[PDB]
Design a protein around this ligand. Structure first.
Ligand SMILES: [Pb+2]
Length: 259
């Protein structure tokens, strides 16, 4: 049982949020649209909407899509300085997973990280992804403050999932994926906005398998994140999990920044 706290819309210094980013693994764009996903977005009214798993491709009028299955999208009220695709490595750039949108005071990276697979069939490749991804982001962040959002396909610590004991050998909670995430946070460096703000808050998840009635029981995993350069922590107002938004097996997450 979890009730996301009210929206804090001012930074620690009292500056009002000026930027609201929403990110959401929609489990098929067409399906999500049929389940009234776009309606919820219109009410949320973000300045920037990142979407993962669109499986489609080809106040939010600038729209950028990348597809190989998978697929991501990035819809923005204002125009970026520059939009670019992938992470600069042939091998990792074929599955429509990353869009990089550069703005005046920061760079936004939306990602759909490769799952390790049933049986952990793709865990070796996942580790190679993780290492290239962390190198690319460290590159970006050496130049401008970074915001990374999306479905990073890993529950960091035991507090990020409802059943840590039963999932230590399943994709999303292996020691390798968890070490990989701790390494991205250390090396770029990046902080986990939600956990920074709510360090001891249990049962806050953003994904629940469609099977076994898991959402109704709250048997979930936190796989979706907003990770921020440490210099953006003074602009952090809040990082929200919209638990009650329906439309997919993942719920949206929303970030407020005062820039
Ligand atoms: Pb899916």
């Amino acid at each position: 049982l979890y009730e996301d706290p009210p929206d804090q819309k001012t930074s620690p210094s009292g500056k009002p949020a000026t930027l609201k980013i929403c990110s959401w693994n929609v489990d098929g764009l067409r399906a999500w649209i049929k389940k009234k996903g776009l309606d919820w977005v219109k009410e949320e009214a973000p300045d920037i909407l990142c979407l993962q798993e669109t499986k489609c491709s080809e106040g939010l009028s600038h729209q950028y899509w990348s597809a190989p299955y998978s697929g991501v999208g990035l819809l923005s009220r204002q125009c970026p300085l520059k939009v670019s695709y992938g992470i600069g490595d042939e091998e990792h750039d074929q599955e429509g997973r990353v869009i990089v949108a550069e703005f005046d005071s920061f760079v936004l990276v939306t990602a759909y990280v490769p799952n390790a697979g049933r049986g952990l069939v793709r865990l070796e490749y996942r580790q190679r992804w993780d290492e290239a991804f962390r190198k690319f982001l460290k590159g970006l962040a050496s130049r401008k403050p970074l915001v990374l959002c999306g479905d990073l396909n890993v529950a960091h610590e035991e507090i990020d999932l409802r059943n840590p004991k039963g999932n230590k050998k399943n994709a999303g909670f292996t020691p390798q994926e968890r070490q990989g995430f701790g390494e991205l946070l250390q090396a770029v460096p990046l902080a986990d906005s939600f956990r920074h703000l709510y360090p001891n808050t249990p049962y806050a998840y953003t994904f629940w398998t469609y099977m076994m009635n898991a959402r109704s029981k709250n048997v979930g995993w936190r796989l979706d994140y907003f990770l921020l350069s440490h210099s953006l922590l003074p602009a952090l107002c809040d990082s929200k999990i919209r638990s009650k938004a329906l439309g997919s097996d993942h719920c949206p997450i929303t970030l407020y920044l005062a820039l």
